[PDB]
Short mmCIF file of C-alpha atoms in Angstrom, two decimals:
data_model
loop_
_atom_site.label_atom_id
_atom_site.label_comp_id
_atom_site.label_asym_id
_atom_site.label_seq_id
_atom_site.Cartn_x
_atom_site.Cartn_y
_atom_site.Cartn_z
CA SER A 29 122.53 84.78 84.50
CA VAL A 30 118.81 85.41 83.89
CA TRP A 31 115.96 86.88 85.89
CA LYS A 32 115.51 84.87 89.05
CA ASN A 33 113.40 86.45 91.76
CA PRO A 34 115.39 87.34 94.90
CA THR A 35 114.88 85.81 98.32
CA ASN A 36 116.26 88.06 101.08
CA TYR A 37 116.42 91.68 99.95
CA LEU A 38 113.86 93.62 101.94
CA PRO A 39 115.13 96.86 103.52
CA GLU A 40 114.17 98.37 106.79
CA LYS A 41 110.77 100.06 106.80
CA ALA A 42 110.60 103.42 108.50
CA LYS A 43 108.91 103.48 111.86
CA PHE A 44 106.74 106.46 112.63
CA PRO A 45 106.38 108.19 116.00
CA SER A 46 103.66 106.96 118.27
CA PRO A 47 101.09 109.33 119.85
CA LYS A 48 102.66 108.76 123.26
CA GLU A 49 106.02 109.86 121.89
CA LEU A 50 104.34 112.88 120.29
CA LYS B 26 125.94 65.29 56.60
CA UNK B 27 124.05 63.70 59.48
CA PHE B 28 125.64 66.28 61.75
CA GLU B 29 124.13 69.36 60.11
CA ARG B 30 120.62 67.91 60.44
CA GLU B 31 121.11 67.00 64.10
CA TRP B 32 122.67 70.37 64.94
CA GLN B 33 119.76 72.49 63.82
CA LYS B 34 117.51 70.93 66.46
CA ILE B 35 119.73 71.86 69.34
CA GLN B 36 120.13 75.52 68.46
CA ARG B 37 116.34 75.78 68.06
CA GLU B 38 115.63 73.91 71.31
CA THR B 39 118.03 76.38 73.04
CA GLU B 40 116.66 79.57 71.48
CA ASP B 41 115.99 81.36 74.76
CA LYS B 42 115.71 85.07 74.09
CA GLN B 43 115.91 86.04 77.76
CA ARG B 44 118.32 88.88 78.36
CA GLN B 45 121.53 87.68 79.98
CA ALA B 46 124.53 88.80 81.99
CA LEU B 47 127.74 87.05 81.00
CA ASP B 48 128.62 85.03 84.11
CA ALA B 49 130.08 81.71 85.17
CA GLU B 50 126.61 80.15 85.18
CA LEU B 51 124.85 78.78 82.15
CA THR B 52 121.35 77.53 81.46
CA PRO B 53 120.59 73.82 81.22
CA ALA B 54 119.52 74.69 77.67
CA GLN B 55 122.96 76.01 76.72
CA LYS B 56 124.57 72.90 78.18
CA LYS B 57 122.73 70.64 75.73
CA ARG B 58 124.35 72.74 73.01
CA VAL B 59 127.87 72.52 74.47
CA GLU B 60 127.54 68.80 75.25
CA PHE B 61 126.60 67.99 71.68
CA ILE B 62 129.75 69.73 70.42
CA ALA B 63 132.07 67.80 72.76
CA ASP B 64 130.45 64.52 71.77
CA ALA B 65 131.54 65.34 68.21
CA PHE B 66 135.02 66.66 69.05
CA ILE B 67 136.05 63.65 71.14
CA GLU B 68 135.31 60.95 68.58
CA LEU B 69 137.70 62.03 65.83
CA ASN B 70 140.93 60.50 64.59
CA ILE B 71 144.12 62.48 65.00
CA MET B 72 144.31 63.18 61.29
CA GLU B 73 141.15 65.24 61.90
CA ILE B 74 142.33 67.19 64.98
CA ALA B 75 145.16 68.23 62.73
CA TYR B 76 142.67 69.44 60.14
CA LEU B 77 140.33 71.29 62.51
CA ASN B 78 143.23 73.38 63.82
CA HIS B 79 143.87 74.29 60.19
CA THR B 80 140.19 75.14 59.55
CA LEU B 81 139.93 77.67 62.37
CA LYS B 82 142.74 79.86 61.17
CA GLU B 83 141.04 79.90 57.78
CA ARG B 84 137.73 80.81 59.46
CA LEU B 85 138.99 83.25 62.08
CA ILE B 86 140.80 85.57 59.70
CA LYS B 87 137.66 85.79 57.58
CA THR B 88 135.69 87.00 60.66
CA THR B 89 132.42 87.84 58.98
CA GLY B 90 130.98 89.50 62.08
CA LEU B 91 131.42 92.13 64.79
CA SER B 92 130.94 91.56 68.49
CA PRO B 93 132.93 92.11 71.71
CA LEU B 94 131.96 88.53 72.58
CA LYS B 95 132.33 86.38 69.48
CA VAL B 96 134.91 86.54 66.69
CA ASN B 97 135.58 90.11 65.73
CA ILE B 98 137.39 92.17 63.11
CA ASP B 99 138.64 94.43 65.91
CA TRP B 100 139.88 91.36 67.78
CA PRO B 101 143.57 92.24 68.09
CA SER B 102 145.45 88.97 67.72
CA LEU B 103 144.19 87.92 64.29
CA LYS B 104 147.21 88.92 62.22
CA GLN B 105 149.59 86.43 63.83
CA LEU B 106 147.36 83.54 62.71
CA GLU B 107 148.69 83.62 59.14
CA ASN B 108 152.21 82.95 60.40
CA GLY B 109 151.83 80.24 63.03
CA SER B 110 149.27 77.44 62.85
CA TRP B 111 150.52 74.66 65.17
CA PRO B 112 153.10 74.98 68.01
CA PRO B 113 154.53 71.72 66.67
CA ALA B 114 155.41 73.77 63.55
CA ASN B 115 157.75 76.12 65.44
CA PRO B 116 160.96 74.14 66.01
CA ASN B 117 161.79 76.59 68.80
CA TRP B 118 158.72 75.19 70.58
CA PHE B 119 160.42 71.80 70.60
CA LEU B 120 163.36 73.38 72.49
CA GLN B 121 161.20 74.83 75.25
CA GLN B 122 159.69 71.63 76.62
CA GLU B 123 162.88 69.57 76.63
CA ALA B 124 164.57 72.63 78.11
CA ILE B 125 161.77 72.88 80.66
CA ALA B 126 161.78 69.10 81.05
CA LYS B 127 165.19 69.37 82.74
CA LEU B 128 164.27 72.44 84.82
CA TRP B 129 161.61 70.71 86.93
CA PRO B 130 164.20 69.74 89.55
CA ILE C 16 119.99 116.38 73.20
CA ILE C 17 118.75 118.45 76.09
CA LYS C 18 115.68 116.34 76.87
CA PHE C 19 116.63 112.73 76.34
CA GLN C 20 117.98 110.29 78.91
CA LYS C 21 119.37 106.79 78.67
CA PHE C 22 117.44 103.71 79.78
CA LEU C 23 119.78 100.74 79.36
CA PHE C 24 122.73 99.38 77.41
CA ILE C 25 122.82 95.82 76.03
CA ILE C 26 124.71 94.06 73.29
CA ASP C 27 122.87 92.31 70.47
CA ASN C 28 119.72 93.03 72.52
CA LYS C 29 120.56 90.17 74.90
CA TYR C 30 123.96 90.57 76.63
CA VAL C 31 124.53 93.24 79.26
CA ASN C 32 128.27 92.83 79.78
CA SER C 33 131.17 91.80 77.57
CA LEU C 34 134.49 90.60 78.88
CA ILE C 35 137.48 91.67 76.82
CA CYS C 36 139.99 88.94 76.07
CA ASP C 37 143.28 89.67 74.29
CA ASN C 38 144.09 86.03 73.59
CA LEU C 39 142.94 83.05 71.54
CA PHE C 40 144.16 80.19 73.74
CA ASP C 41 140.54 79.19 74.40
CA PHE C 42 139.72 78.08 70.87
CA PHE C 43 142.70 75.82 70.12
CA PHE C 44 143.03 74.43 73.67
CA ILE C 45 140.78 71.47 72.90
CA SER C 46 142.64 70.92 69.65
CA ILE C 47 146.08 70.76 71.27
CA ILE C 48 145.55 68.57 74.35
CA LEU C 49 143.82 65.88 72.28
CA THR C 50 147.07 65.42 70.37
CA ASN C 51 149.26 65.50 73.50
CA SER C 52 146.83 63.12 75.24
CA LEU C 53 146.43 60.59 72.43
CA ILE C 54 150.09 60.50 71.36
CA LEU C 55 151.07 59.28 74.82
CA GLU C 56 148.64 56.36 74.47
CA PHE C 57 150.53 55.32 71.38
CA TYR C 58 153.77 55.68 73.31
CA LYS C 59 152.29 53.43 76.04
CA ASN C 60 150.57 51.00 73.62
CA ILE C 61 153.29 50.52 71.02
CA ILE C 62 155.52 49.28 73.87
CA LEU C 63 152.97 46.61 74.82
CA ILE C 64 153.11 45.39 71.23
CA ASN C 65 156.90 44.92 71.22
CA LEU C 66 156.90 43.24 74.64
CA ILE C 67 154.73 40.45 73.25
CA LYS C 68 157.45 39.64 70.72
CA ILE C 69 160.27 40.26 73.19
CA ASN C 70 158.63 38.18 75.95
CA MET D 1 87.77 93.61 86.71
CA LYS D 2 88.15 96.01 89.60
CA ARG D 3 90.88 94.47 91.73
CA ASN D 4 90.52 96.19 95.09
CA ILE D 5 93.61 96.94 97.15
CA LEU D 6 94.09 96.51 100.89
CA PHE D 7 96.78 98.66 102.45
CA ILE D 8 98.62 97.54 105.56
CA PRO D 9 100.77 99.96 107.57
CA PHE D 10 104.39 99.24 108.46
CA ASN D 11 103.94 98.80 112.22
CA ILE D 12 101.66 95.84 111.55
CA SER D 13 102.78 92.29 110.81
CA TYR D 14 100.50 89.62 109.44
CA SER D 15 100.13 85.95 108.59
CA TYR D 16 97.94 83.84 106.32
CA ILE D 17 96.51 80.48 107.24
CA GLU D 18 94.69 77.61 105.54
CA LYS D 19 93.46 74.13 106.34
CA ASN D 20 94.81 70.90 104.94
CA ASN D 21 91.29 70.59 103.55
CA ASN D 22 91.83 73.93 101.73
CA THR D 23 88.12 74.74 102.18
CA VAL D 24 88.85 77.57 104.67
CA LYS D 25 91.15 80.57 104.29
CA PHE D 26 91.78 83.33 106.80
CA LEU D 27 94.22 86.01 107.72
CA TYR D 28 95.67 87.31 110.96
CA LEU D 29 96.97 90.80 111.82
CA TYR D 30 99.06 91.17 114.95
CA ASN D 31 100.66 94.17 116.64
CA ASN D 32 102.29 94.80 120.04
CA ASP D 33 98.88 95.79 121.44
CA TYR D 34 96.08 94.40 119.25
CA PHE D 35 95.25 91.41 117.09
CA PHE D 36 92.60 90.96 114.40
CA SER D 37 91.48 88.31 111.91
CA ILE D 38 89.13 88.03 108.98
CA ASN D 39 88.43 85.31 106.41
CA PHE D 40 88.04 85.06 102.66
CA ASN D 41 85.41 83.04 100.84
CA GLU D 42 86.31 80.27 98.40
CA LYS D 43 85.40 82.76 95.64
CA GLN D 44 87.82 85.52 96.72
CA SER D 45 91.36 85.07 95.39
CA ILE D 46 94.22 87.00 96.91
CA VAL D 47 97.70 88.36 96.15
CA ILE D 48 100.25 89.72 98.63
CA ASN D 49 103.32 91.96 98.43
CA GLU D 50 105.79 92.53 101.22
CA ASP D 51 107.31 95.13 98.89
CA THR D 52 104.33 97.46 99.53
CA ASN D 53 102.29 95.91 102.36
CA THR D 54 99.39 95.84 99.93
CA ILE D 55 96.98 93.00 99.20
CA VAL D 56 94.92 92.55 96.03
CA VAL D 57 91.49 90.96 95.77
CA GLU D 58 89.35 89.47 93.03
CA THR D 59 85.71 88.53 93.68
CA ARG D 60 83.93 85.92 91.63
CA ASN D 61 80.86 86.77 93.72
CA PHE D 62 80.66 90.28 92.21
CA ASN D 63 79.56 91.87 95.48
CA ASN D 64 79.67 95.68 95.36
CA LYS D 65 79.87 96.06 99.13
CA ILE D 66 83.60 95.33 99.10
CA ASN D 67 84.38 98.93 98.18
CA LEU D 68 83.08 99.82 101.67
CA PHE D 69 84.79 96.80 103.23
CA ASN D 70 88.07 98.39 102.18
CA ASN D 71 87.67 101.80 103.82
CA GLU D 72 86.66 100.22 107.12
CA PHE D 73 89.49 97.71 106.97
CA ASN D 74 92.06 100.28 105.84
CA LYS D 75 91.15 102.95 108.34
CA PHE D 76 90.60 100.52 111.21
CA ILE D 77 94.24 99.52 111.03
CA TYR D 78 95.70 103.00 110.60
CA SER D 79 93.56 103.72 113.61
CA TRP D 80 96.27 101.86 115.64
CA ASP D 81 99.10 104.10 116.84
CA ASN D 82 98.24 106.93 114.43
CA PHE D 83 95.90 109.90 114.53
CA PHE D 84 93.64 111.50 112.03
CA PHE D 85 93.91 115.28 111.74
CA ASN D 86 92.05 118.36 110.55
CA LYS D 87 92.50 122.11 110.64
CA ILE D 88 90.04 125.00 110.99
CA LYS D 89 90.40 128.70 110.17
CA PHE D 90 88.55 131.96 110.10
CA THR D 91 88.83 135.40 108.53
CA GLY D 92 86.94 138.40 109.87
CA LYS D 93 86.95 141.54 111.95
CA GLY D 94 84.96 141.02 115.13
CA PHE D 95 85.92 137.36 115.40
CA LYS D 96 88.12 135.54 117.92
CA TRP D 97 88.27 132.54 120.18
CA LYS D 98 89.83 131.44 123.43
CA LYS D 99 91.20 128.01 124.23
CA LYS D 100 91.36 126.34 127.65
CA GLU D 101 92.02 122.61 127.93
CA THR D 102 89.94 121.17 125.07
CA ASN D 103 87.23 123.75 125.76
CA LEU D 104 87.08 126.25 122.92
CA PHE D 105 85.25 129.55 123.40
CA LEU D 106 83.78 131.12 120.28
CA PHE D 107 82.63 134.72 119.81
CA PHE D 108 81.24 135.20 116.29
CA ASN D 109 78.60 137.97 116.50
CA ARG D 110 75.95 135.94 118.35
CA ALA D 111 73.97 136.85 121.42
CA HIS D 112 74.18 133.36 122.92
CA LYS D 113 77.06 131.31 124.28
CA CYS D 114 79.01 129.12 121.83
CA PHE D 115 81.12 126.76 123.91
CA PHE D 116 82.74 123.76 122.23
CA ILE D 117 83.66 120.87 124.51
CA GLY D 118 85.64 117.88 123.34
CA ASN D 119 85.17 114.40 124.73
CA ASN D 120 88.32 112.39 124.04
CA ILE D 121 89.92 114.61 121.40
CA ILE D 122 93.06 116.70 121.15
CA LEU D 123 92.95 120.40 120.36
CA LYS D 124 96.03 122.58 120.13
CA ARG D 125 96.13 126.17 119.04
CA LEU D 126 98.75 127.32 116.53
CA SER D 127 97.57 130.87 115.96
CA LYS D 128 94.60 133.13 116.50
CA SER D 129 93.09 132.11 113.15
CA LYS D 130 93.93 128.43 113.23
CA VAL D 131 93.34 125.34 115.35
CA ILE D 132 93.94 121.62 114.79
CA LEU D 133 91.87 118.72 115.99
CA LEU D 134 93.28 115.22 116.40
CA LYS D 135 91.58 111.91 117.07
CA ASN D 136 91.89 108.26 116.15
CA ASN D 137 88.41 107.90 114.63
CA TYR D 138 87.64 109.88 111.49
CA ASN D 139 83.88 109.73 111.92
CA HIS D 140 83.79 111.40 115.35
CA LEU D 141 86.20 114.05 114.12
CA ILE D 142 83.94 115.41 111.42
CA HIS D 143 81.01 115.53 113.82
CA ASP D 144 83.40 117.36 116.14
CA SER D 145 84.83 119.67 113.49
CA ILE D 146 81.64 120.57 111.72
CA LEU D 147 79.85 121.85 114.81
CA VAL D 148 82.47 124.63 114.80
CA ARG D 149 81.67 125.23 111.15
CA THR D 150 77.92 125.61 111.60
CA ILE D 151 78.32 128.71 113.77
CA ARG D 152 79.55 130.71 110.80
CA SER D 153 80.49 129.37 107.39
CA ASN D 154 81.84 130.94 104.26
CA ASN D 155 79.69 133.64 102.73
CA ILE D 156 79.29 132.94 99.02
CA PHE D 157 80.06 136.63 98.40
CA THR D 158 83.19 137.00 100.56
CA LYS D 159 85.49 134.40 102.06
CA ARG D 160 84.78 135.79 105.53
CA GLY D 161 83.81 133.34 108.24
CA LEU D 162 85.20 129.95 109.22
CA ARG D 163 86.25 127.13 106.97
CA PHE D 164 88.26 123.94 106.88
CA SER D 165 91.80 124.21 105.57
CA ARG D 166 91.00 121.85 102.68
CA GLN D 167 87.58 122.34 101.11
CA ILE D 168 85.61 123.37 98.05
CA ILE D 169 84.89 127.08 98.49
CA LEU D 170 82.20 128.95 96.58
CA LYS D 171 82.38 132.58 95.55
CA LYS D 172 79.96 134.98 93.95
CA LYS D 173 80.43 138.60 92.94
CA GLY D 174 78.86 141.41 94.96
CA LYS D 175 78.98 145.20 95.04
CA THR D 176 81.31 145.73 92.07
CA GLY E 12 110.32 96.42 86.87
CA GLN E 13 112.01 98.50 84.21
CA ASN E 14 109.08 100.22 82.61
CA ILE E 15 107.33 101.03 85.88
CA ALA E 16 110.39 103.02 86.80
CA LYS E 17 110.52 104.63 83.37
CA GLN E 18 107.13 106.22 83.91
CA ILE E 19 107.89 107.46 87.44
CA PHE E 20 110.99 109.27 86.24
CA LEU E 21 108.84 111.22 83.80
CA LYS E 22 106.30 112.21 86.42
CA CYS E 23 109.19 113.51 88.52
CA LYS E 24 110.46 115.77 85.73
CA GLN E 25 107.76 115.91 83.09
CA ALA E 26 105.38 117.05 85.82
CA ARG E 27 105.01 120.62 87.06
CA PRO E 28 107.56 122.28 89.39
CA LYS E 29 105.06 124.32 91.43
CA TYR E 30 103.81 121.18 93.15
CA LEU E 31 107.37 119.99 93.89
CA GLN E 32 110.06 121.31 96.17
CA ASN E 33 112.74 123.63 94.87
CA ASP E 34 115.65 121.27 95.54
CA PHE E 35 114.01 118.27 93.84
CA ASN E 36 116.51 116.32 91.73
CA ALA E 37 115.55 112.96 90.20
CA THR E 38 118.07 110.70 88.56
CA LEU E 39 118.33 107.39 86.79
CA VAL E 40 121.04 104.77 87.02
CA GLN E 41 121.53 101.31 85.52
CA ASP E 42 122.63 99.01 88.35
CA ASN E 43 123.23 95.51 87.12
CA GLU E 44 124.31 94.51 90.62
CA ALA E 45 120.94 95.11 92.26
CA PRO E 46 118.55 92.27 93.03
CA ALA E 47 115.63 94.15 91.46
CA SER E 48 114.95 97.54 90.00
CA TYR E 49 114.20 100.05 92.76
CA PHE E 50 112.64 103.43 93.51
CA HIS E 51 114.51 105.03 96.40
CA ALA E 52 113.09 108.24 97.81
CA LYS E 53 113.71 110.86 100.45
CA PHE E 54 111.20 113.11 102.12
CA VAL E 55 111.48 116.45 103.92
CA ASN E 56 111.33 115.64 107.63
CA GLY E 57 113.76 112.71 107.55
CA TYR E 58 111.89 109.80 106.01
CA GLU E 59 113.62 107.49 103.53
CA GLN E 60 112.57 104.29 101.80
CA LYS E 61 113.09 101.97 98.86
CA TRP E 62 110.52 100.04 96.82
CA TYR E 63 111.55 97.25 94.49
CA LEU E 64 109.51 96.97 91.33
CA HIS E 65 109.80 93.49 89.80
CA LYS E 66 106.39 92.53 91.25
CA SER E 67 104.45 95.68 92.09
CA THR E 68 102.29 98.15 90.17
CA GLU E 69 102.13 101.91 89.89
CA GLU E 70 98.96 101.97 92.00
CA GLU E 71 100.32 100.03 94.96
CA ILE E 72 103.14 102.58 95.10
CA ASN E 73 100.96 105.68 95.30
CA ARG E 74 99.10 104.60 98.43
CA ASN E 75 102.48 104.20 100.13
CA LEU E 76 103.28 107.77 99.09
CA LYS E 77 99.96 108.90 100.55
CA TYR E 78 100.79 107.00 103.75
CA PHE E 79 103.79 109.36 104.05
CA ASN E 80 102.34 112.54 102.60
CA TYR E 81 99.29 112.32 104.83
CA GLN E 82 101.54 112.25 107.90
CA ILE E 83 104.04 114.92 106.97
CA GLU E 84 101.08 117.32 107.06
CA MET E 85 100.37 116.14 110.58
CA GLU E 86 104.02 116.83 111.40
CA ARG E 87 104.53 120.16 109.65
CA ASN E 88 101.17 121.72 110.55
CA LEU E 89 102.06 121.21 114.21
CA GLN E 90 105.25 123.18 113.49
CA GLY E 91 103.06 125.99 112.09
CA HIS E 92 103.86 125.48 108.40
CA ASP E 93 101.12 126.18 105.80
CA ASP E 94 101.89 123.50 103.20
CA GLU E 95 98.53 124.17 101.49
CA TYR E 96 97.61 125.87 98.24
CA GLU E 97 95.52 128.90 97.46
CA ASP E 98 91.93 128.25 96.50
CA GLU E 99 92.28 130.07 93.18
CA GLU E 100 94.75 127.60 91.58
CA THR E 101 92.27 125.13 90.07
CA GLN E 102 88.56 125.54 89.63
CA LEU E 103 86.28 122.76 88.47
#
């Protein structure tokens, strides 16, 4: 009903290609 | 007159200007307000519950104020209030319950 | 206007939403049940007065 | 106050540790391959965000070296499973190169040989007038990239010669 | 977390279109259902993220954007694309 900070909201975080992959 | 003095504390002490979203929940602050009202509505003789129900339909038709939450001019059902005050007034109401009283089985 | 956008909508600067009721049962509910709750106690207590005489 | 900022990449995951005594404070970075720790004095206060993988610092000690402490710390972590990159160009008539297995052959109007030989770099040609270098340390790269530059650089009169792909270029009129 | 997103929406449209893509469309929505106000974004080569804003700053966000924009160059240059600007655009 008022601003309470969330607890479990974090999205995935994009993984970049590794130099072996590239 | 001891009620007006006591009341003005509790509205102050529950002035919380945080923006809100109308939900089932309520603050502990708001509950001190509600709980003070119920303490005053319980301890009243039946001659007074009669009167309060008469006050409201003198105060609700006046409706000095606009809001989609509180009392409102654009509130639809105000016009009926002039006609009916208590369901005990309608003698038809007295038919329904005794009629329904025999329909339970 | 071509170069304005909206930022938020709130009611009396504090309420985001507003339910729409068509009915006033909520106000008088406390006023009714207190009659229908107390009047029974008379119906159950007046009897206990007469029984003292009758017994 | 200047509140310096410590970036952390996304591949990395970290933890923060303290004593019961609360007189020691340190921090632990940990990846599939590596792991790394570093402490904070009693006079450095800290703030963390998982929202951004950024950490904020205040310093009651007022040490100005921290601004260098950042760039080392920041780049030392992005040095894990990521490259640094750079690109080189040229514009001219009698200019060329040839590329053979990280051994770049330069011919820019000079009597002597001009071989460039890369120890532990990557070099891949994209066109005649363009080549990229890649390496994990930024400081070896520039020493590797600038040697190519010193053979010919931009004339201040004409943009003929070599140059980086991002740079401040100078120009001056000539022969109107 | 409101006002931080106010300013970003300006820099997406109040800013100059040369230094943006052609198909750049920024929006704004009021989502009461969210946990926190967010800045969702989508890049060229596939990347996509979200950053909630009830705790962060405008400066902590930009270094994330650099952490992407610095790499997309390393991805697109390898493809042969010149994503760079002419030298004559801004002098000192």
